[PDB]
């Protein structure tokens, strides 16, 4: 049961480098690619993320795509960069220019066939293929346009598998680029049709994690990408290690999605504690569950307290009793009963895996389906409506060739997504 990864754009390649560091560490793979682990339990599922090279080596099933090679030269220069297969790097000769239409229509259609050829070569090698995993930013240029193009083509070619995305969305407080609303709106329109499961992250939420919980004096993008690499590598842990109650991406989707459009989820990871404090408080299931549901520990700016949970899932790693897990989930559902949608009799799924990450006794990753996702899209739509009425920068997109009708369609589809979440928020039994 093998996963294929795709890394697109600057953000995607940077997050990917930290992810593949974490995965290589957990399976005891040296930065040369040689296996150096210390238990057989590591080897029996190495196939899930690694391909086998001949003598010692293992190679990671990932495709790297970008429009200017600057990022690729940076990732090849990183500490684990050597592990990546040379043939898996696909690049052009000029940048996306932060423009969705350029990235989607002109250089996209030129390169996309060589990427599809690489993805098919990689897909047909698996003995049984599980879903794809995609990392990209929505605010950029090549990430949004070429990522969504590629997602649409893979959904055409492999409609029965799972499609999973991790996606970066513009912060509410400071922009890194002026034209973020257009690229975000077009990408959310593409994603809500194409995706099976989508995770959303705000950089502002990672800064608040670092400053309030970890009390870092001078955080850097390496810390944010380490938190993200931790949750991404955590969601798949039950796929690749034994446990008392196994779980799977399809099983997560089946338990999380009540209706097919409602597939946008919030993420959290529980054991976070400052360097001074960690000696002062031991890990236990009550402590992990209480931090796990605190909105301070959630990776988006919207807070659950303004909405209601339709469904949630928790994956626990470590050797622990099932009774304590079950009774904690019952106690949280009973004490806070107004925040859970009442026409579903039990909203939380649990899963248990024996093997924690090294140097932690226990860990949990949390996936939540909460109606507060509507607040992010509404804010992006507001900034879009302010810019679009005045044609603020539209000539760039029209000069690439786009019809204005695409913008009105994408706006209408995002507004309908917000409306559907709002209606289920305010729904009643009657």
């Amino acid at each position: 049961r093998e996963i294929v990864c795709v890394q697109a754009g600057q953000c995607g390649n940077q997050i990917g480098s930290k992810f593949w560091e974490v995965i290589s560490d957990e399976h005891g793979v040296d930065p040369t690619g040689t296996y150096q682990g210390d238990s057989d339990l590591q080897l029996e599922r190495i196939n899930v993320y690694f391909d086998e090279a001949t003598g010692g080596r293992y190679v990671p099933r990932s495709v790297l795509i970008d429009l200017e090679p600057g990022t690729m030269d940076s990732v090849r220069a990183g500490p684990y960069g050597q592990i990546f297969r040379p043939d898996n790097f696909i690049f052009g000769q000029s940048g996306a220019g932060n423009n969705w239409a350029k990235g989607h229509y002109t250089e996209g259609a030129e390169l996309i066939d060589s990427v599809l050829d690489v993805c098919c070569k990689e897909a047909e090698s698996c003995d049984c293929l599980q879903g794809f995993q995609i990392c990209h930013s929505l605010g950029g240029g090549t990430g949004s346009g070429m990522g969504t193009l590629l997602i649409s083509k893979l959904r055409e070619q492999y409609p029965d598998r799972i499609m999973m995305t991790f996606s970066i969305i513009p912060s509410p407080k400071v922009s890194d680029t002026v034209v973020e609303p257009y690229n975000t709106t077009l990408s959310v329109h593409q994603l809500v049709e194409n995706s099976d499961e989508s995770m959303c992250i705000d950089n502002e939420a990672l800064y608040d994690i670092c400053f309030r919980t970890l009390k870092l004096t001078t955080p850097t993008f390496g810390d944010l990408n380490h938190l993200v690499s931790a949750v991404v590598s955590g969601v798949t842990c039950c796929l690749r290690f034994p446990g008392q109650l196994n779980s799977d991406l399809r099983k997560l989707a089946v338990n999380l999605v009540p209706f097919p459009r409602l597939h946008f989820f919030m993420m959290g990871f529980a054991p976070l504690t400052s360097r001074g404090s960690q000696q002062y408080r031991g890990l236990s299931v009550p402590e992990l569950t209480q931090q796990m549901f605190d909105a301070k520990n959630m990776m988006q700016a919207a807070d659950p307290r303004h909405g209601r949970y339709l469904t949630a899932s928790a994956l626990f790693r470590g050797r622990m009793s099932t009774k304590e897990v079950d009774e904690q989930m019952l106690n949280v559902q009973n004490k806070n009963s107004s925040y859970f949608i009442e026409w579903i009799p039990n909203n939380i799924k649990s899963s248990v895996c024996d093997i924690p990450p090294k140097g932690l006794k226990m860990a949990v990753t949390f996936i939540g389906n909460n109606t507060c996702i509507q607040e992010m899209f509404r804010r992006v739509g507001e900034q879009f409506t302010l810019m679009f009425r005045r044609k603020a920068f539209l000539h760039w997109y029209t000069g690439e060739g786009m019809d204005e009708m695409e913008f009105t369609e994408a706006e209408s589809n995002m507004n309908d997504l917000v409306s559907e979440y709002q209606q289920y928020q305010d729904a009643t039994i009657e």
Binding site: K251, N255, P258, T322, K323, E324, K349
Partner: protein, 442 residues
């Protein structure tokens, strides 16, 4: 003489590990399949034959299959300690799970696996000379246990016909829960299970957690404890086939005495001397004390209270140092009690069994060593409460067609929900009519 065990999915394989641990240790088979040759044995013996067959070299191999759609649990069994005990063909594993979808197990994926399973079961049934039933262990909350268990029971029922099928199912607990879609899978499972099963022993996890907290002194139990208790129950029920006794009880006698009408085969279970080693030396454990224990609801392994219903039949199995006169005095004392009531059409409410072999003690176990034990299976109308609450949760979800697109997309008609829900409504009425005292006769 012989019985074949079928283990399905995660709960069924994990419970199988505890069961086969117990049957090995009780007969004396080592984890490598070879009994200790010792110096000599004075007379030839056969009790293992119910569960083991010997090769011409004297290795033992067990009469069981392990069925799963995901590899991980069966590969875990394959790599464990009992590797050499099982025949490798018996451990059957697919590629991918039924993802909590009954439809994926029944229609799409199990249809590929069933012919290998049927060929293995045929090869087992050909190596028997007095097969007298199937024992089935599965959970109805998950996708493959429900869907493939139903499909396989249907095929077994057509090919083998009249042979008996006894199930030790694990139904969903009344407020502890593990997955969202449990009501749909349990309803759809129960629809198939109604037509094609002879005696359904129903178990819940919340009761065994309560039992391990209250009687044993364990604050943080895990599935190995529950599975060892279940294994003890199975060993108690099958002991009547395997060892000498005063009053033996063949598996056909359970069905004859316990089942009044062909749909009324849902039963409750209870086991008496669950006790720790430190408590065990302060108290005697006479026949009448454990008989009084088995009727308290704190002893039951399912979450239902029998005081809200009427008993129809009870079957009491005593094993160990017991004398029939003490069993008779105990049953007469129970019969005297006013909070135990039988339906007026069942005057002779009890079946007894008495076996000389005391319960075995497992090295890592938590139960004390005791000279006698009693195990009960009983039919009571209080089991209606278990269904009505599952059906209410189904109605709550189905009013909004909750998650339904998964089931309809993977190949199932929407019509299938309404038929099953109407069948469970009819089961509720069966329990209403059977529980009615009398009519307006002259």
């Amino acid at each position: 003489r012989e019985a074949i065990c079928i283990h399905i999915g995660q709960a069924g394989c994990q419970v199988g590990n505890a069961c086969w641990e117990l049957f090995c240790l009780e007969h004396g088979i080592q984890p490598d399949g070879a009994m200790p040759s010792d110096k000599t044995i004075g007379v030839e013996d056969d009790a293992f034959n119910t569960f083991f067959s010997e090769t011409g070299a004297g290795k033992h191999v067990p009469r069981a299959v392990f069925l799963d759609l995901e590899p991980t649990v069966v590969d875990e069994v394959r790599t464990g300690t009992y590797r050499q005990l099982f025949h490798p063909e018996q451990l059957i594993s697919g590629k991918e799970d039924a993802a909590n979808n009954y439809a994926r197990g029944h229609y799409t994926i199990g249809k590929e696996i069933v012919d290998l399973c049927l060929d293995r079961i045929r090869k087992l049934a050909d190596n028997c000379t007095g097969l007298q039933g199937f024992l089935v262990y599965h959970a109805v909350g998950g996708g493959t246990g429900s869907g493939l268990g139903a499909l396989l029971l249907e095929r077994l029922s057509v090919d083998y016909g009249k042979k008996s099928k006894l199930g030790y199912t694990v139904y969903p607990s009344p407020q502890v829960s593990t997955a969202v879609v449990e009501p749909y899978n349990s309803v759809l499972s129960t629809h198939s299970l109604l037509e094609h099963t002879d005696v359904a022993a129903m178990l819940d996890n919340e009761a065994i957690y309560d039992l391990t907290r209250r009687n044993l002194d364990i604050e943080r139990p895990t599935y190995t404890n529950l599975n060892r208790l279940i294994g003890q129950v199975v060993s108690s029920l099958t002991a009547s086939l395997r060892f000498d006794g005063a009053l033996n009880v063949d598996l056909t006698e359970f069905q004859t005495n316990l089942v009044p009408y062909p749909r009324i085969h849902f039963v409750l279970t209870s086991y008496a001397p669950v006790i720790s080693a430190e408590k065990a030396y302060h108290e005697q454990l006479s026949v009448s004390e454990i008989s009084n224990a088995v009727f308290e609801p704190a002893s039951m392994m399912t979450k239902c209270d029998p005081r809200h219903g009427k008993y129809m039949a009870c079957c009491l199995m005593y094993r160990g140092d017991v004398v029939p006169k003490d069993v008779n005095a105990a049953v007469a004392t129970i019969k005297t009690k006013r909070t135990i009531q039988f339906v007026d059409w069942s005057p002779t409410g009890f079946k007894c069994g008495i076996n000389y072999q005391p319960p075995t003690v497992v090295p890592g176990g938590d139960l004390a060593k005791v000279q006698r034990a009693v195990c009960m299976i009983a039919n009571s109308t209080a089991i209606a409460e278990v269904f009505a609450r599952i059906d209410h949760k189904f109605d709550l979800m189905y009013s909004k067609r909750a998650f339904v697109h998964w089931y309809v997309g993977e190949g199932m008609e929407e019509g299938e929900f309404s038929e099953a829900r109407e069948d469970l409504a009819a089961l509720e009425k069966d329990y209403e009519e059977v529980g009615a005292e009398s009519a307006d006769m002259d």
